[PDB]
Design goal:
Two copies of one chain form a homodimer.
Chain A: H1 2-5, E1 9-16, E2 21-23, H2 27-34, H3 41-52, E3 58-60, H4 65-70, H5 82-108, E4 117-122, H6 131-139, E5 146-151, H7 157-172, E6 177-184, H8 198-201, H9 203-206, E7 210-217, E8 229-238, E9 246-251, E10 254-259, H10 263-278, E11 285-288, H11 293-303, H12 311-320, H13 327-341, E12 353-360, E13 364-371
Parallel strand pairs in A: 4-5, 4-6, 11-12
Antiparallel strand pairs in A: 1-7, 1-8, 2-3, 6-7, 8-13, 9-10, 12-13
Bound molecules: coenzyme A (COA) (2 copies).
One coenzyme A binds near residues 192, 200, 279 and 281 of chain B.
């Protein structure tokens, strides 16, 4: 189609995670032990129950027990540890982003010199110059790669990078190729347990580390690049009077995340709306940010979805946890790879139209209308 | 094609005349016995070409938050709590004035781009602005955090592609705010980088509306200068932001943007210029390498004189001053009677944002 030819497409996807794996079944014992809080028995039971119903099987994490032993204020509640967290993240966030971006560029199959833009997203550390510059340096990007840095936008940053990339790619022409890199390291917000701050306990059961990279461009060269998905449209909306749903406070003791109990119902109730406002509900594919099991379940129940509609998102939640920014790109990668391994008609599990939802502080919702490519 | 449809500015009300500032700075930090350091600071202020600066951080705000004035003391939480509230409030004052000049309803906006290097929060300053302004829930927000002094030009580069790819109903509000609460530091004889920043950095907010007119955004491009990473460095720490400014930055910058002019534009006094007022030497390099007459840099010199180095929003102040004086003094276009112009923002990297502009006819 000429319609599909003129429009921004995703040309490659790849992911990376830190090497140390933490199985959720052992995490309550480890979490309450390295923070030296084993005497908070009632709290540990409450946290145990939290990890069991989190539908997370394993998480990858840079913050190991050895790194807590070298930066022990990170494991001591209210203690000054912001400088220690910053030093790690300013170094490690771009490195892990390089691991994922090298793989994405290998799939795209073009030289570094054909990149024109870089969009870097992270809520893990802040610096001047920022992680976008540091990524460009350690990858040897040319001086003409135009950088955009998306700091602290939480779990909708991956979706928002695609909204920006679509307008950049389409308005400057077929030369324009955007590299998107989203990285999260839970060094930023790890906090020791306390019965005063029950809103922080949930985050230590779900948040994890990972990096995803993608290439976006329009007007593709019909011999080197082929699209995995086309970005049809992308729109951000804000839920009125919900600012206290997800709150991140960056402090001398690191970041203090506050997660309201009602976020999954409010998000789930809103994204079901967006689906309807934007588009049989089993005839399209879905990428939902695995904020919690309750959001994915509400999609299924309120839209009457089969089990296979949400499978890629349940999957990334189980194998990686809540990685914030990059998570929707892990699910996009997981959907297309299984679609090809199982020989389905399209990269969207055999279907044509699809939606991607990111959401986070605000509450903010990013909705990306997608379309498969035939396999 | 994308155009600037309105521009307005705001500043904190407290004025600090530069002639008084070495005395004030060393007094409120209880460092006046550091007499040789203070004489070095005096020479820096006296050569800055800054006449006055507007600043949120007054003596009273230091007294309320004493650790801001004690070198190395933990003051990050105190700084954060001021800025998360005060940055969007200052931005609101500028945005309301820009929407008023525009003449269209606030509800006709479709996008908000907020830029600041002063404070970080979730949700961020862009949400807080939308909240205190009552922007409708359909306004699509983008937050540009910690990009230094090229943030204002970078927002124009993004706004151009958003306005042009979405149609004619797309209207983007750009808001850039800086408060030096973020990086104010007490003097030390072993950290001379702070001495520079305390002589030049100041507070302000600017707002612009973009749609696809006062100027037309012909093109915009970012580039990075190799082997210059350590020229402008910002380290956000428990003591607040710790900046490091290389003495060679104005020469690396000035030689680069002089070269950007040459490569991009294909008589130098026949175009107009907006140069981020990083300091006097960058402006003097433009004048000297391009053989510019004295009126070319007048608007950039004027903003430096009357506001200091406000980082992100500075180029919009200069753009506003240029078109305002162009109208009042009876020039034939918004760019001082000239047709083509260029805006240069720059900051950590070193990163350069180049925006090719075009004026519109007035009387
Ligand atoms: C494990 C998890 C994923 C699912 O838990 P759940 O089964 O839906 O909730 P349950 O009622 O079954 O029990 C969870 C326990 O943790 C408590 N809890 C759950 N959410 C809480 C919250 N935001 N704040 C404080 N306590 C909370 C509950 O009170 C409950 O305690 P109890 O059963 O011991 O009395 C949970 O961590 C969760 O859902 N968190 C919300 C996810 C979210 O908000 N993501 C934001 C998108 S970035
Ligand atoms: C401070 C400023 C007034 C420059 O002053 P100047 O024209 O160089 O005047 P001088 O060369 O005589 O130097 C004055 C004093 O300031 C010192 N100084 C100037 N820049 C310095 C720097 N980056 N670091 C440490 N010391 C510096 C000089 O060592 C000198 O000390 P001395 O009087 O004891 O001998 C200001 O215009 C400036 O520094 N601009 C560039 C700063 C920058 O990097 N901006 C980019 C961020 S947007």
């Amino acid at each position: 189609s000429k319609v599909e030819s003129r429009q921004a497409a995703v040309l490659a996807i790849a992911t990376a995670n830190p090497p140390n794996i933490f199985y959720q079944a052992d995490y309550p014992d480890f979490y309450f032990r390295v923070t030296k809080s084993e005497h908070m028995t009632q709290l540990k039971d409450k946290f145990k129950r939290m990890c069991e119903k989190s539908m997370i099987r394993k998480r990858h994490m840079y913050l190991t027990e050895d790194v807590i032993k070298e930066n022990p204020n990170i494991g001591i509640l209210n203690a000054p540890s912001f400088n220690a967290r910053q030093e790690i993240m300013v170094e490690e966030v771009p490195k892990l982003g390089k691991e994922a971006a090298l793989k994405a560029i290998k799939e795209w199959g073009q030289p570094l010199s054909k990149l024109t833009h870089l969009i870097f997203c992270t809520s893990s550390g802040v610096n001047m110059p920022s992680a976008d510059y540091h990524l460009a340096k350690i990858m040897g990007l040319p001086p003409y790669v135009q950088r955009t840095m998306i700091y602290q936008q939480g779990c909708f940053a991956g979706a928002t990078a695609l909204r920006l990339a679509k307008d950049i790619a389409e308005n400057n022409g077929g030369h324009t190729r955007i590299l998107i890199v989203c990285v999260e390291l839970m060094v930023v917000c790890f906090q020791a347990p306390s019965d005063t701050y029950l809103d922080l306990l949930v985050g230590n059961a779900i948040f994890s580390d990972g990096a995803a990279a993608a290439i976006v461009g329009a007007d593709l060269d019909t011999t080197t690049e082929r699209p995995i998905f086309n970005i049809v449209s992308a729109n951000q909306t804000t839920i009125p009077d919900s600012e206290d749903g997800i709150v991140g406070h960056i402090r001398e003791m690191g970041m203090k995340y506050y997660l309201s109990r009602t976020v999954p119902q409010v998000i789930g109730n809103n994204i079901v709306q967006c689906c309807r406002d934007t588009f049989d509900w089993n005839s399209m594919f879905y990428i939902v940010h695995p904020g919690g099991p309750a959001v994915l379940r509400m999609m299924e129940e309120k839209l009457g979805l089969s089990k296979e509609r949400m499978r890629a998102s349940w999957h990334v939640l189980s194998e990686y946890g809540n990685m914030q920014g990059p998570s929707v790109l892990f699910i996009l990668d997981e959907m297309r790879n299984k679609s090809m391994e199982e020989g389905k008609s399209t990269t969207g599990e055999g279907l044509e139209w699809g939606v991607m939802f990111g959401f986070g502080p605000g509450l903010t919702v990013e909705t990306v209308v997608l379309r498969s490519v035939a396999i």
